[model samples]
Target: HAGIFTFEEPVTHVSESIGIMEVKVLRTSGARGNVIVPYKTIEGTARGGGEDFEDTCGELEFQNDEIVKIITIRIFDREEYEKECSFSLVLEEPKWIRRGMKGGFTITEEYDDKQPLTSKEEEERRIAEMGRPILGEHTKLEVIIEESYEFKSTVD
Candidate 1:
């Protein structure tokens, strides 16, 4: 996550119909790596207070007793060999993408294919895909972009 900006406009709404953002960003019950898209986010739905939350969820939490809004972004490669890297995005930097394997980070997938797969390899690939996690360790790199924007709002 990089280059995140904030705005104080209320943009959250329940659509009376389902046509605006027609796509759904996938979310995982455990780790965060399934909700990275250009126009979507992942949010934690659970709620609790102080120690009750700290023991269960290791990540940051909301004040008092509240649910935390979080999203996991998955940077999928057009080629399958680049699946070992991910970044937890903050609202400050929201429009970044997984560029490639370079810089100081190294990504090693348990099932990255280099050439045509055999029948046995194909089966293994399918299983790995089905059980794969989107959020994982990877090298971080500085990305270049022209224009950028970030969203924010104020309460009461």
Candidate 2:
């Protein structure tokens, strides 16, 4: 049978909509025996205890727990300023050698690429599109304009 055994890799990147991260424990040397390893998350918010992560149902449970080969973790997507989040996977003390590998993976949310532009920025972009010649053909003249207005507040 194969001798040395550990996690396949150290780090991986995933997305929230993808909803699952797969971690595989494999034999380091040969392909003779079935690789069986028990593992779990470190626990708590500092670890994988956030509401965005789950370990019971959905994609968080192992595909085949009987042989204990592959583990999957579920990821949840949220609409907030928090760009991304990460978690760690810990390999339990295996019977093979000293210890196995600890892997960390991050889940990132997709950003809204179609954000509306501010009036000033949009005006500048339009000016550039129309060509610098219209602003006076190689004159290299530059201008800056600003407008200010006051708003009435009802909160008081």
Candidate 3:
């Protein structure tokens, strides 16, 4: 049987710089066997891959009867933050090589290193995203990033 998944909340709130962002994933409907969950951190108003927050992704495994699982997102909390930054956690379904994501990655024809997603390809990907998935709401977790404050230490 197929199962349904969602996050405990839609948005996570916090102040910046090196803090643990605790997120939870809940699975419902079917829990008879182990399942694979595909998740990744994406950029928003804030940059990703360490620009705003640490970027990560994996095929997380879930065991039977474990309704909810916890994952920690790492964030920066010191020095520089402009104010009102944010990012999101995206979940992918059974479809690994996402259909509309045709222009999203790779350069198999050239090298094993990498090929960037150009503006045109990025634009198409967004349009393609209009036709996307099952879990719906909780599938994408938005985190509100706040400015981190710092104070000078007393006594020279």
Candidate 4:
């Protein structure tokens, strides 16, 4: 009997601090049997900025009756900024599995450990951006008015 196998999802995003990939088996014919799910990292797809996995690529064994999490992909943490790296888990169909029925998941590493500006830093930066007052002196202003006097006569 033939079986179908595929990844739970085509693509997935995982944290740089941690990550995982889940795979399952499907039996449309209701036939239960053992199947070998060969998996490997696609060439040029695997990338980490000085980050590596505690566990590398490997294969999975599955029985047609139930869904199983076949793989756990891990990404290490980094102190500096790293471009998000990704790798695809390519699943190959076994003899019992139908051709063109294979599935895989793309694991993307989340950017972590980036240095973030604190509130104090941000305030200092803003103040610096405003800068100091212009050093040039301004011209002064003056006003003048003529004085006048009026005499009043009183009747005797």
Candidate 5:
């Protein structure tokens, strides 16, 4: 459940070094430098402190002590292939949202027209601008982040 997810097209590798994880983007038409690295890893020695990562992708808020609690899943695609691919999982006990759902989605739009179409060339550009996929089918993403960190609570 905690691993990289590949698309139906082409991909290189999701490199993870000593305390650093790089989601290498490859073969994709646009966003050649599309890399998803932990903010703490990039901060290095000087800036390596708490609360360095704070990414709000939709309803989720990744910040503070939660920075170190994440897994980087890098995927890629080739020029010729066109298919929808994804990977995700649910936490044993969900805190933010409920469980028993599909988890992640290739894309999430309010309506059909909100999504980009293959017919439109500009759509590709828009996709690149968006960077990460929209958070709609994420029944697991929230739980994953929740479980990633060690929530401290003292019972009375």
Candidate 6:
């Protein structure tokens, strides 16, 4: 009943520039409903606060006829000596882990504490070990690495 979403790239490399940078988010199938996708920037080698890219956390809205959305980033100017640094962008809210009210209950196939009966502690632990979905093939985080252009181009 909803649209499928993912990042355009698994890993995005941006040549260091003191200009605007666009991170694309793609939508498929259903763009019929209004979806607010929450996203955050995780700290990596490319950090925020005048380091590499301005760290941001916000929501992405999908409306009618909206397929490709851009998460604009203001790239910071860096020194030539600076090495290639990276950061990560994670899409949240799409993942959910549902346990029995956070294990406020237990399972029992036996009258007493037996092998067939799952203890409350053990049951909670099992739920804790459950893995959440990263959505799909493109639902994973998008890596943003800022590579120094100084070494890439000799003369331009």
| RMSD of each candidate relative to the true structure | 20.1, 26.5, 11.5, 34.7, 19.5, 10.2
What are the Cα lDDT values of the candidates? 0.24, 0.38, 0.59, 0.40, 0.25, 0.56
Weakest lDDT window of 10 consecutive positions for candidate 3: 94-103
Ranking by TM-score: 3, 6, 4, 2, 1, 5
How many backbone clashes does every candidate have? 5, 0, 5, 0, 0, 0
What residue runs in model 1 are displaced by over 4 Å at the alpha carbon? 1-28, 33-106, 109-120, 133-156
TM-score of each: 0.19, 0.42, 0.62, 0.47, 0.18, 0.60
- Scored against the true structure, residue 115 in model 1 reaches a CA lDDT of 38
The sequence of per-residue lDDT tens digits that candidate 6 reaches over residues 67-141 is 557787766776545555777787765322123223432232333455322345576655442422223354654
Better-scoring candidate (lDDT), 5 or 6: 6
Model 3 lDDT, residue 2, Cα: 43
lDDT of 3: 0.59
Candidate 5, residues 36-102, lDDT tens digits: the string is 3221122221111222222222111222221223334322211222222222322121111112123
lDDT digits (tens) for residues 16-37 of candidate 4? 4544433333333432444555
Off by over 4 Å in 4: 19-31, 43-45, 48-50, 97-156
TM-score of 1: 0.19
Task: Report the C-alpha lDDT of model 1 over 131-153, residue by residue, as the tens digit.
Answer: 43232222121111111213234
Better TM-score candidate (4, 5): 4
User: How would you encode candidate 2's per-residue C-alpha lDDT over 1-156 as one tens digit per residue?
Assistant: 223334545444555555666655544343222223455654333224445566432222222223335566766553333523444555542222111322421111322357422234455766433321111112110111012212233131
If both were scored by lDDT, which would come out higher, candidate 1 or candidate 4?
Answer: 4
Look at candidate 6 and give me any clashing residue pairs. Answer: none
| lDDT, model 1, position 13 | 24
In candidate 4 the C-alpha lDDT for residue 61 amounts to: 57
- Writing each residue's lDDT as its tens digit, candidate 3 over 1-156 gives 345667766676665754778776776553444556778887877777676677778765554544556767778654463666778887766221222223543222422245323324455765443332235454778877766534323221
Query: In model 1, how large is the Cα lDDT of residue 154?
Result: 21
Clashing pairs in 4: none
